[PDB]
C-alpha cells in the first residue's frame, strides 16, 4: 500500500497510516550550498542531527467557526532546541524545511483544509498608511488567526480571510506548493520546501523566508457526538542546515 | 566562413475508440496537490487532429518585452520657485499600476533594461504670448546612490564627469539607452517580507531594497521671457528576462506607492442564483 | 559618404520594436547567476495549474467564503439541477478572477480544451451519483436532465476516489475564440444534475458541499497581447 | 560575424534574416524572443512518487 | 556561399492557311457553361507573330498592392468638449468607396497589412493668433477587442504596457508599421450571408464578423493658448495577398458603411437606336 | 559612425513603394492556411469569362 | 544570407538586385510581386467531361 | 579571409584547515615599506570559493573614459561692446573642479582626445520681443600658438585657410571631433615643480607648460533686430589612455585656476570619543 | 541610395558612448613613446597600498597630527578597550579620506576582504599583548572583551616584529555592498582590547602610541563609476 | 578588414561583435577598453630582496 508513509530525521520519526503523496517544493530537494555559488569565505558550521530533527509546535483547536491560521518561519522555530541557539549565535543561515500537519477525525465528520507555503508573504496593515510592529504578525510559536470581517484596529494586520492579507484572491493560492486535508480520505499533509531566496544566505532574524497558512475551505460539521473540537498539530524539521558568521548571541 | 547558421507546436489529438476496462483515468485525488493530466481522448471518442498552434506569444520574454510608461513630471523653464524648474525622481517601478501588476506576477526577476525618454513642451497661457525662441535642449542626469545631488538648475553638479548623461534637442527622435543588470543580489525582488534592522524594527517591506538612485532633468540654458512648461515620460522595456516563483495576480486596487496596503474586496461579481445562465 | 534615403517610419518610437542601443555603463560586471528553484518560462505553465472556482454567486452571500461551496441535501427532488454556468472563461463572472481567467484577460484570442475537476467534501459514509454534462452552443440551454444528457457528459460515482474530471473538448467552427466572447463565438453551457441522490446513515450531517477546479489542457494557447481592464487608477500613486 | 536564422511564418504556406552586433556590451543586443522551450512539470506534478493517470490515484 | 541566386509571355500566334474540313471550331454550345477556347488562327488565315507581352501588372498582388486611404478625422489640442480632443475609430474597410469596391471583388482574402499614418496640423482662425509653440507630438494607440478604452485625453489608459503604440513628432517622415494576418478564421470575409444568433435573429451581414478593435489618437501633452486642429489619415496596403471566389463588381452607389443597401440603377446608358454607331 | 549622405526623395511617402517595416505584434502565430476552392491569381482569369452584353439600348 | 534575383526589363534590349531581411517576422518582408503563374481553367472549363474545340460541342 | 578573430577574474579562496607551526604569516614589519600580502586563508579556516568578480570597470581607460565639461561661456549676437560678441578661451583643464581632480590623481598622462560641443540659444528679455529669425549658424575656430587672433566678430582672421574650423547649424546633433597627442614632450604633465627662467625666476608651476592655443566662437552672420544670447559647453573625453606615478587625491578645495594655492583643512571629521561606534 | 530608417536615440549625445569621429589634424606625427617608470593600469593597484588611518578623532584634537596615534598607558584597568570603530570604508569618517576610501568614493558598489595592520611605536624594552576582534553585523556591538572574543580575532604579541595584520574576511549575504552603506548592508565592527597589559622597566616613558594601516586584499573590486561628493565649487575658477 | 571579438557578458549564463575602421588616423578609432592586465607589484613590493610571507620579515 502507498497510503502509509514513514519519515526519519535525526533522532525523531514520523509515521502516518492514512496519508496522501508527498509534495516536493518545486521539484527540488534540499541540498547544501555549492562551492561555485557561495560568497562568504569562512568555513560554514553543519550541525547535522542536532538541528535537523522534527520539532512539534503548540496545538490549536478547530471549531465550527474557525477561519484559519498562519505561522511565519523561521521565527516560529527561533526559540526551539539547538536550532534557536545556532540562529542566535550566527549572522548568516540557510536551511530547507519539511512541514507535516496532523488532523484526524472519525468517519462521520466532514471538512476540508488547505495547507500552503507562501514564500515572501508580505502583508499590509489594517489602516492603510499606518505602520505595525513586529508583533502583529510573528510572536514566536503562537498561531495568528484570520478574521471573517474586515479588520479595524490600526495596530494589527488586515485579517480579511477572502483576501488572505495580501490583496489577492484566496482561491488562487493553489499556485504555491500545497496539499489538501480532506477528512474523507486524509489525515495529514507533508510538504518539502527547499531554500528559496534571491541570495545564497540571509539572516534568519530579519527576513521571513516563507509563511505557512491553514484555511478551512469547508467548515467542520458533525452531529450527535461527544467530541466538540478537532485539534490540529504542526511539525517542522530543518534540512541541510548550515550557518556562518559567529558573533555574540542575540 | 563569414556566416553562422543558427517550431514546438502544441500536442496533437490521437484517435480513440470505445473502451471498457478497469483503467479509470477520470477519477483522481486532488488531495495530493497534483493536477490531473487527462486529455479529451481519455474520456470520449476523438478523431485524429494535427495541431499547428504554438505558444510563442505566451513566453515571459514576449509578455514583459513591451515598453511601458513608469513616470511623468513637469518642469518650467523659468519660475520664481527654484524647486519647480527641475525634476528629481527616485527610481522605482511601483508608481504606475499596469506595469506594477505585470511585474508583480513573479517574485524574482533578472533582466536587462532599455530606457526611452519622451519630452514635449508647451507655452503657458498669459496676457502676452508674442516671442521668438530657438529650439530647446534638455539634459538627463543619472546619479547612483551616494553621489552629489544638485540643489538648483544652475548648480555645479550638472558638470558630470563620471555620472552618465544625455543631451537631447527637440524635434529629433526620442532618446534611448540600455542598462545592464545592476542589482547587488542575484535577482531583483518585487517583494521582501522582512525588516531593515536586525531586531525586527524600522522600515518594512520592499521599500528596504530600493537603492537604485535618482534621475534629474533640466533645461540646459533655455530661459524664455515668458514661462514654458515641459513634460518628460520614462519608458522601461525589460530584455533577456528570467523569472521565478510565480504568484497570483493582485485583486485589490493599489493605494500606496511603497506598501501593500489595500482595502478588502469581494471575490467576484454576483448573479441572480446558482442556476441562472441567461 | 554612402548614398542613402530615409523611408517612412524613421524617428518613430514603437513600443514593441527590437533594436540595439548603446550601453551607458560600459564593461559593467553583472552578478553571477544562481539557479533559484521554480523557474517559469511560459505563462501557460501557470495557466495549467488548478484553482478554486467561485460558483456560488447567489447575490446574497453575506460571507465571501460561501462562494466556493455548492450546497447539497439528502432528500432531493428526483433529477434536480445542482448548478449551471456559461462557458466564458474570460468574461463570465465565475471564471473572471480565477488563476486561468486572469491570464486570459491579458490576451484577446484563446483556443484549446479545458478541465473541470469536482471534489466531494462530505462525510466518509455519504454516497451518491451525479451527472455532469457539457452542452455545445445552441439556441436554448438545457432545462432538464433528459435534455442535458444528450450532450457530452460523464457519470460521477462518489467513493474512495473523492474527485472526478470533465474534459470540455474544443468544439468550434473557428481555430480561435475571442476572450470578449459574443453570440458569434459562444461556447456553450455546463450543468450538473442529481443522478441517484445523496444517502447518509444515522448520525451524520444532512448537508454537504462540493468544490470545482478549473485549468487548461496541454493543447491550450493564447494570442494578441492586450492590457487587462481589471486594474485602473485615477491619480499618480504616492 | 553575421548570424543567419529563420523567421516566424505559417504552418504549411526566403524566411531568413541576418543580424550583426555593433556594440561591445551584451546588454545592447536585441531581445532573444526566439526561445520556445517550456516544462510545466515543476508546477503540475510536484509529487515525490510518480503517479500514472490510468491507475487509481490512491491504492 | 553567402549568396543564393533565386518571364511568362502571353501565347503566340501560329500561321494558318486555307482549310476545308468537317471540323468546326466556330460552332459551340454555351448551354454547357463552358467558355469557348477558339483563337483567331481557327477562323481566318494568320501570320506567325512572336508576342512578348506579359500579364505581370494584372496579378492580384500588384492590383491590391497600393496604399489607399481608409479613414480621416480631426481632433483639437484644446477645447471645452472632452470628446472633441481625441479620436476613436472602430477598424473597418467599408468607410471609403474606392478601396471598398476594390476589396469587394473577391469573397475571401488573406494578406499581411502595412499601415501608414499621415498627420497635419493647422491653427484655427481667431481674433488673436500671435503665439509661439514648440513642435507637437502625437500618440497612436491600438486597443484589441475587450481592452480598456480611454474616456478623456489625460486618462490612465494612455500608459500602454501591452497595447502597441507609436509616438511621432511633426516634421519627420510619416509613421509606418506592419501587421500580420490576425483573423480568427482561415481568411477574411468581405461578405457574410448569415445572422448572429442561432435562431436567425439579431445582426445580419458582414457587421457580425467585424471585431478588429479600435484606434485612438491624441496630442501627447500639447495644450496651446489658442486652439490648434490636427487631421490624421490612415492608409492600408495589403501584402502577400491571396484571393478566392471572385464576384462581379458593384454597380450601385454605396449608401451605408455597414450594409449592402442600395437603390435600383439602370444597367447602362442609352443610345438613339440599335443601329446608331456615330 | 559610417559616413553617409541623404539623396533626394528621403522621408517621402510613395503609395507604390516596397520597403520593410517593423512588426508591431512580434512572434504572432497566424492561423493555418486552408485551400479554399476557387483561388484566383490574376484578374485576366476573370476577364476571360463570358458575360451578357446589353446591346439593345434603344433609349425607350 | 543575401538573395540575388533578376529584375523586370525589356524583351530583347546588370539586371540583378540584392535583398536582405532585417526583421525576425516574415510579415515585415517586402511584397513578393515577382510571381506570374496563372491558370484560367478553373473558371473557363469547369465541365466534367473534357470537350475538344474541333469536335462539335454536342453529339 | 576577410575577418580576423581577436576574462581575468579576481583570485579565488582556497580551503584552509587548522594549523600549528613555526610559520607566522600574520607578523611582518612595515618599516621595509612593503605591504603585506596575507590573505584570509592564512589566519583562519576558510572554505573553497570560486570567485567570478572582475576588475574591468576599474581600469584607467574606463575611469577616465567619460566626457566631462571643461568650460562654458556666453556671447551675444548683437551688442554695443565688441568684445562681448565672441569668445576667446586659452585651452586648459584646470577650470572645472571635478575633471581637474580626476586628472590630478596621476603625474603624467598620454592620451588622444575627443571633443564635443553643445550650443544653445535664448532670446534676451525686453519690452518688444516680436521678431522672426531663421536658424542660426556658429563657427568654432582653433588657433595653435603664435597664430593670428581675431579682434572683432567680422575680422579677416575668420577666413581660416590652415586653422581647422567647424560650422554648425542649430537643431542638429552636437559637433564632435578627435585630436591626437599633441604635446612636445613624451607625456602631458599635470604638475611642474620648476621655474621658467634658468636663474630660478619668473613663472612657477604648471602654468609654464600650458601652450595649447586658443579657441574662438562666433555667430557666422546672424544679427537679429533684438539681442540673442548663446552658450557653448566644451566636453573632453580621453581615449587610449596611459598614466604614470599616481599621487594622493587632493583634500583642500581649489581656489585658483593656475596655482596650487589652498587653505589648511582638517584631516577628517570628529566623533565623541575613540570608543564611540553608535 | 540604400534605404534606411532612423531608430530612437539618433542625434543624442551620451557621455559614455564609443564612436569613431573624424580627425582634425590629419597625418599628425605624435612624439615617440618612452617607458616612464611607475606605470599604473588599474586603480586597484593604488587601492592595495597601505595608508595611515586617523583613528583618534576625539573632537578635541587641538593638534591635527594627534589624530594618527592611539594612546596607551602602563597600569591599565584589566581588559580595557583601546579603540572601536564601524567598518564602513566609504562612509565612516575614519576611512573616508584614506587612500582606500578616496578610491571607493568614486564608485557605488564594493566587495572583497580588507587588511588592517597595526604597528607598535613604543620603546624597545616595552612589552604587551593585545586582542583585536572583528564582529560581523548584529543587533548590538560588543561592550566587553568576553563579548568581543566570540567573533573573529587574533592575539597580537609585541616583540622583534613590530607589526601584525588582521584580515577582515568578506562575510556578507550579497555579492556586493553599497558604498553609501545602510542598515541593510551593514558590515560590523572592529575593536581592540588589552590582553595582558603593557609593562615597562625603570627609566622609560609611561605612555606609547599605535598606528593603523588600511588596504585591500587581492580579491577586492568596485563597480558603478559615480561622482565623488567631497569636492565642489560655487563659481568658475579664475 | 573586419575584426570579430567577444563582448562582455556573465560568468556561466552570439556574444560576438564586428568592428571596422573608416578613417585613416588611428586617433579616430574607438576606445580600447577591453584590456584587463594589471600588476600591483611595482607599488606593493618595491623592495630589493624578495621577502616570503611565511618567514619572518626580519631575521
Ligand atoms: C523595484 N524594481 C526593481 C528592479 N529595478 C530594475 C531596474 C534597474 C535599473 C534601472 N535603471 C533605469 C535607468 C535610470 C537612469 C539611467 C540614466 F539615464 F541615468 F543613464 C538609465 C537607466 C531600471 C530598472 C526596477 C525597480
Ligand atoms: C473588413 N476588413 C476585414 C479584413 N481586415 C484586415 C485588417 C486586419 C487588421 C488591420 N489592422 C490595422 C492596424 C490597426 C492598428 C494598428 C496599431 F497602430 F494599433 F498598431 C496597426 C494596424 C487592418 C486590416 C480589414 C477589414
Ligand atoms: C593641462 N592639460 C594638459 C593636457 N592637455 C591635453 C589636451 C591637448 C589638446 C586638446 N585640444 C582640444 C581641442 C581644441 C580645439 C580643437 C579645434 F576645434 F580647434 F579643432 C580641437 C580640440 C585638449 C586637451 C589638456 C590640458
Ligand atoms: C561596428 C560594426 C560595423 C559593421 C558594418 C556592417 C558590416 C560590414 C562587414 C560585412 C559583414 C561581415 C561581418 C563579419 O565578418 O562577420
Ligand atoms: C540586422 C542585419 C543587418 C545587416 C547589415 C548589412 C549586411 C552586412 C553583412 C554583409 C552581407 C552578408 C549577409 C549574409 O551573410 O547573408
Ligand atoms: C570607408 C569604408 C566603408 C566601409 C563600408 C562597409 C563595409 C563594406 C565592405 C564589407 C566588409 C568587408 C571589409 C573588409 O574587407 O575588411
SS (H, E, C) J1-50: CEEEEECECCCCCCCEEEECCCCCCHHHCCCCCCCCCCCCHHHHCCCCCC
Q: From the centroid of its chain, how far is CA A242?
A: 20
Residue E273: count other Cβ atoms within 10 Å of its Cβ: 11
F2 lines ligand 2 (CB under 6 A): no
| Pairwise CA distance, residues H213 & H211, whole Å | 6
CB contacts, 8 Å: I3 with chain F: 19
Q: What cell was used for E34?
A: 463552358
Query: From the CB coordinates, do chains H and I have 3 or more pairs under 8 Å?
Result: yes
| Pairwise CA distance, residues H123 & H120, whole Å | 11
Is residue E143 classed as helix, strand or coil in its secondary structure?
strand
Q: List the CATH number of the domain containing D8.
A: 4.10.80.10
Which residues neighbour C140 within 8 Å (Cβ) at sequence distance 6 or greater? none
Question: Whose CA is closest to C192, among C48, C72, C75?
Answer: C72
Q: Are J17 and H6 in contact (CB under 8 A)?
A: no
Cis peptide before I32 (omega within 30 of 0): no
Q: Are B175 and B117 in contact (CB under 8 A)?
A: yes
CA-CA distances (angstroms) from residue A122 to A161, A179, A211? 15, 21, 9
Query: From the CB coordinates, do chains J and I have 3 or more pairs under 8 Å?
Result: yes
User: Domain containing I45: what range?
Assistant: 1-238
CB contacts, 8 Å: J33 with chain C: 26-27
Residue D37: count other Cβ atoms within 10 Å of its Cβ: 9
Query: Which residue has the least CA distance to atom 16 on ligand 4?
Result: D1
J2 lines ligand 4 (CB under 6 A): yes
Domain count, chain G: 1
Residue B176 CB burial class (10 angstroms; 0-12, 13-18, ≥19):
buried
| Pairwise CA distance, residues A213 & C65, whole Å | 16
Q: Is F44 on the interface with E (CB under 8 A)?
A: yes
Select from C38, C41, C126, C164 the residue whose CB has the most chain A CBs within 10 Å, as the one to mutate to test that interface.
C38
**Which residue has cell 483547536?**
A61
Largest CA distance in chain I: 97
Chain C CA closest to residue H50: C32
Strands I221-225 and G16-19, by their bridges, are unpaired
Which residues neighbour C138 within 8 Å (Cβ) at sequence distance 6 or greater? C188, E198
CA-CA distances (angstroms) from residue J51 to H36, J54, J57? 10, 9, 7
H117 lines ligand 3 (CB under 6 A): no
Q: Are B11 and C218 in contact (CB under 8 A)?
A: yes
Query: From the CB coordinates, do chains H and G have 3 or more pairs under 8 Å?
Result: no
Which residues neighbour C177 within 8 Å (Cβ) at sequence distance 6 or greater? C109, C110, C111, C185, C187, E184
Provide the 8-state DSSP code for E41: G
Q: What cell was used for E112?
A: 499581411
**Residue E245 phi, psi dihedral angles, 5° rounding:** 55, 75
The answer to whether the CB atoms of J7 and D24 lie below 8 A apart is: yes
Question: Whose CA is closest to I9, among B74, B115, B87, B44?
Answer: B115
By Cβ distance, the residue of C2, C11, C29 closest to I10 is C11
Three-state secondary structure of chain A: CCCCEEEEECCEEEEECCCCCCEECCCCCCCCCCCCCCCCCECCECCCCCCCCCEECCCECCCCCCCCEEEEECHHHCCCHHHHHHHHHEEEEEEEEEEEEECCCCCCCEEEEEEEEEECCCCCECCCCCCCCCCCCCCCCCCEECECCCCCCCCCECCEHHHCCCCECHHHHHHCCEEEEECCCCCEEEEEECCCCCCCCECCCCECCEEEEEEEEEEEECCCCCCCCCCEEEEEEEEEEEEEEECCCC
CB contacts, 8 Å: J24 with chain I: 26-27
Q: From the centroid of its chain, how far is CA B66?
A: 9
The answer to whether the CB atoms of B271 and C218 lie below 8 A apart is: no
Residue H225: count other Cβ atoms within 10 Å of its Cβ: 11
What distance, in Å, lies between the first and last C-alpha atoms of chain G? Answer: 60
| Pairwise CA distance, residues D3 & H130, whole Å | 57
| Pairwise CA distance, residues H205 & H197, whole Å | 12
Q: Are C129 and C198 in contact (CB under 8 A)?
A: no
| Pairwise CA distance, residues A117 & A210, whole Å | 6
**Residue E3 phi, psi dihedral angles, 5° rounding:** -140, 155
| Pairwise CA distance, residues E123 & A37, whole Å | 65
> Which residues contact ligand 6 via a Cβ below 6 A?
H 2; J 1-2, 20, 22
The size of chain F, in residues, is 60
Identify the nearest ligand to the CA of H258 by its number.
3
A192-A198-A201-A206 Cα dihedral, nearest 10 degrees: -90
Nearest ligand 6 atom to alpha carbon C1: 1
Residue B266: count other Cβ atoms within 10 Å of its Cβ: 15
Is residue H273 classed as helix, strand or coil in its secondary structure?
coil
Q: Are A198 and B186 in contact (CB under 8 A)?
A: yes
Domain count, chain I: 1
Could you please report the per-residue DSSP string of I45-63? HHHTS-EE------S--SS
Q: Are H91 and H214 in contact (CB under 8 A)?
A: yes
Q: List own/partner pairs for H150-154 with CB under 8 A and 24 or more apart.
A: H150/H86, H150/H216, H151/H82, H152/H82, H152/H85, H152/H86, H153/H82, H153/H85, H153/H86, H153/H218, H153/H219
CB contacts, 8 Å: C39 with chain D: 42
In the complex, which subunits touch B with 3 or more CB pairs below 8 angstroms?
A, C, D, E, F, H, I
Q: Are G51 and G57 in contact (CB under 8 A)?
A: yes
Give alpha helix (H) positions in F1-60.
Answer: 43-47
For the sheet containing G2-6, what is the strand order?
E3-5, G2-6, G16-19
* Distance (Å) from the alpha carbon of B116 to chain D's nearest alpha carbon: 14
CA-CA distances (angstroms) from residue B177 to B69, B211, E29, I111, J5? 15, 20, 74, 27, 23
| Pairwise CA distance, residues B109 & C33, whole Å | 12
- Which run of H or of E encompasses I223? strand I221-225
CB contacts, 8 Å: E133 with chain B: 122-123
User: Domain containing J16: what range?
Assistant: 1-59
Alpha carbon of I16 to ligand 5 centroid (Å)? 27
Alpha carbon of A28 to ligand 4 centroid (Å)? 45
Q: What cell was used for B234?
A: 520614462
| Pairwise CA distance, residues B165 & B181, whole Å | 19
E84-E88-E94-E96 Cα dihedral, nearest 10 degrees: 40
Q: Which residues pair with J2 in a beta bridge?
A: H3
Q: What cell was used for H107?
A: 603625474
E106 lines ligand 2 (CB under 6 A): no
Alpha carbon of C132 to ligand 1 centroid (Å)? 52
Given ligand 6 and candidates H1, H2, H3, which is best to mutate, with the most ligand atoms within 8 Å of its CB? H2
Q: Are E110 and E186 in contact (CB under 8 A)?
A: yes
Is residue D58 classed as helix, strand or coil in its secondary structure?
coil
Q: From the centroid of its chain, how far is CA B232?
A: 17
Three-state secondary structure of C164-183: EEEEECCCCCCCCEECCCCC
The size of chain A, in residues, is 250
| Pairwise CA distance, residues A167 & B264, whole Å | 7
**Which residue has cell 567631497?**
I230
Is residue C143 classed as helix, strand or coil in its secondary structure?
coil
The answer to whether the CB atoms of H60 and I50 lie below 8 A apart is: no
Q: List the CATH number of the domain containing I143.
A: 2.60.120.20
By Cβ distance, the residue of H2, H121, H123 closest to B2 is H2
CB contacts, 8 Å: H95 with chain I: 236-237
Alpha carbon of H113 to ligand 3 centroid (Å)? 7
**Which residue has cell 501560329?**
E14
User: Which runs of E-coded beta strand occur in B124-227?
Assistant: 137-143, 165-169, 175-179, 188-189, 214-219
| Pairwise CA distance, residues B189 & B207, whole Å | 11
Amino acid at each position: 500500500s502507498d497510503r502509509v508513509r514513514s519519515i526519519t530525521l535525526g533522532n525523531s520519526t514520523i509515521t502516518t497510516q492514512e496519508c496522501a503523496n508527498v509534495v516536493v517544493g518545486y521539484g527540488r530537494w534540499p541540498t547544501y550550498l555549492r562551492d561555485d555559488e557561495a560568497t562568504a569565505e569562512d568555513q560554514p558550521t553543519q550541525p547535522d542531527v542536532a538541528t535537523c530533527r522534527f520539532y512539534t509546535l503548540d496545538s490549536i483547536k478547530w471549531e465550527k467557526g474557525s477561519v484559519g491560521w498562519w505561522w511565519k518561519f523561521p521565527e516560529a522555530l527561533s526559540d526551539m532546541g539547538l536550532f534557536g541557539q545556532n540562529m542566535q549565535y550566527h549572522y548568516l543561515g540557510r536551511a530547507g524545511y519539511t512541514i507535516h500537519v496532523q488532523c484526524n477525525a472519525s468517519k462521520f465528520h466532514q471538512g476540508c483544509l488547505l495547507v500552503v507555503c507562501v514564500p515572501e508573504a508580505e502583508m499590509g496593515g489594517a489602516v492603510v498608511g499606518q505602520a505595525f510592529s513586529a508583533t502583529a504578525m510573528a510572536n514566536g510559536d503562537k498561531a495568528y488567526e484570520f478574521t471573517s470581517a474586515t479588520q479595524s484596529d490600526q495596530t494589527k494586520v488586515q485579517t480579511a480571510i477572502h483576501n488572505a492579507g495580501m490583496g489577492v484572491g484566496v482561491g488562487n493560492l493553489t499556485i504555491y506548493p500545497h496539499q489538501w486535508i480532506n477528512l474523507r480520505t486524509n489525515n495529514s499533509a507533508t510538504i518539502v520546501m527547499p531554500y528559496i531566496n534571491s541570495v545564497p544566505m540571509d539572516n534568519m532574524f530579519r527576513h521571513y523566508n516563507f509563511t505557512l497558512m491553514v484555511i478551512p475551505f469547508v467548515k467542520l460539521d458533525y452531529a450527535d457526538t461527544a467530541s466538540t473540537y478537532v485539534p490540529i498539530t504542526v511539525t517542522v524539521a530543518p534540512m541541510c542546515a548550515e550557518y556562518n558568521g559567529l558573533r555574540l548571541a542575540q | 566562413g563569414d556566416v553562422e547558421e543558427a517550431v514546438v507546436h502544441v500536442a496533437d489529438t490521437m484517435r480513440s475508440g470505445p473502451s471498457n476496462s478497469a483503467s479509470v483515468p477520470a477519477l483522481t485525488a486532488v488531495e495530493t496537490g497534483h493536477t490531473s493530466q487527462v486529455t479529451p481522448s481519455d474520456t470520449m471518442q476523438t478523431r485524429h487532429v494535427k495541431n499547428y498552434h504554438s505558444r510563442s506569444e505566451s513566453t515571459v520574454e514576449n509578455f514583459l518585452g513591451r515598453s511601458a510608461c513608469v513616470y511623468m513630471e513637469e518642469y518650467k523653464t523659468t519660475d520664481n520657485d527654484v524647486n519647480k524648474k527641475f525634476v528629481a525622481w527616485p527610481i522605482n517601478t511601483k508608481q504606475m499600476v499596469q506595469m506594477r501588476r505585470k511585474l508583480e506576477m513573479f517574485t524574482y526577476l533578472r533582466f536587462d533594461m532599455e530606457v526611452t525618454f519622451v519630452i514635449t513642451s508647451r507655452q503657458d497661457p498669459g496676457t502676452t504670448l508674442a516671442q521668438d525662441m530657438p529650439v530647446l535642449t534638455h539634459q538627463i542626469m543619472y546619479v547612483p546612490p551616494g553621489g552629489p545631488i544638485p540643489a538648483k538648475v544652475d548648480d555645479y553638479a550638472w558638470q558630470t564627469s563620471t555620472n552618465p548623461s544625455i543631451f537631447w534637442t527637440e524635434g529629433n527622435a526620442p532618446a534611448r539607452m540600455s542598462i545592464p543588470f545592476i542589482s547587488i543580489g542575484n535577482a531583483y525582488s518585487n517583494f521582501y517580507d522582512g525588516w531593515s534592522n536586525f531586531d525586527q524594527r524600522g522600515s518594512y517591506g520592499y521599500n528596504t531594497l530600493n537603492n537604485l538612485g535618482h534621475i534629474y532633468v533640466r533645461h540646459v540654458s533655455g530661459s524664455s521671457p515668458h514661462p514654458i512648461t515641459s513634460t518628460i515620460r520614462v519608458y522601461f522595456k525589460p530584455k533577456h528576462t528570467r523569472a521565478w516563483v510565480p504568484r497570483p495576480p493582485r485583486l485589490c486596487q493599489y493605494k500606496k506607492a511603497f506598501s501593500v496596503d489595500f482595502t478588502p474586496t469581494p471575490i467576484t461579481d454576483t448573479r441572480k442564483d446558482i442556476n441562472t445562465v441567461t | 559618404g554612402l548614398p542613402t534615403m530615409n523611408t517612412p517610419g524613421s524617428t518613430q518610437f514603437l513600443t514593441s520594436d527590437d533594436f540595439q542601443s548603446p550601453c551607458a555603463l560600459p564593461q559593467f560586471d553583472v552578478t553571477p547567476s544562481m539557479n533559484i528553484p521554480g523557474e517559469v518560462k511560459n505563462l501557460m505553465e501557470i495557466a495549467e495549474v488548478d484553482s478554486v472556482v467561485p460558483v456560488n454567486n447567489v447575490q446574497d452571500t453575506t460571507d465571501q467564503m460561501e462562494m466556493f461551496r455548492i450546497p447539497v441535501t439528502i432528500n432531493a427532488p428526483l433529477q434536480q439541477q445542482v448548478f449551471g454556468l456559461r462557458l466564458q472563461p474570460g468574461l463570465d463572472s465565475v471564471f473572471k478572477h480565477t488563476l486561468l481567467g486572469e491570464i486570459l484577460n491579458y490576451y484577446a484570442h484563446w483556443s484549446g480544451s479545458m478541465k473541470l475537476t469536482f471534489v466531494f467534501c462530505g462525510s466518509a459514509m455519504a454516497t451518491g451519483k451525479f451527472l455532469i454534462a457539457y452542452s455545445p452552443p445552441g439556441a436554448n440551454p438545457p432545462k432538464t436532465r433528459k435534455d442535458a444528457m444528450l450532450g457530452t457528459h460523464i457519470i460521477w460515482d462518489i467513493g474512495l476516489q473523492s474527485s472526478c474530471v470533465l474534459c470540455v473538448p474544443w468544439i468550434s467552427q473557428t481555430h480561435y475564440r475571442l476572450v470578449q466572447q459574443d453570440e458569434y463565438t459562444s461556447a456553450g453551457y455546463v450543468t450538473c444534475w442529481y443522478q441517484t441522490g445523496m444517502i447518509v446513515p444515522p448520525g451524520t450531517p444532512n448537508s454537504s458541499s462540493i468544490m470545482c477546479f478549473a485549468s487548461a489542457c496541454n493543447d491550450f494557447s493564447v494570442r494578441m497581447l492586450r492590457d487587462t481592464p481589471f486594474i485602473s487608477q485615477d491619480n499618480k500613486l504616492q | 560575424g553575421a548570424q543567419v536564422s529563420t523567421q516566424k511564418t505559417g504552418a504549411h504556406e526566403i524566411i531568413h534574416y541576418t543580424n550583426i552586433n555593433y556594440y561591445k556590451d551584451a546588454a545592447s543586443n536585441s531581445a532573444n524572443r526566439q526561445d520556445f522551450t517550456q516544462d510545466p512539470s515543476k508546477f503540475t506534478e510536484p509529487v515525490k512518487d510518480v503517479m500514472i493517470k490510468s491507475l487509481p490515484a490512491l491504492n
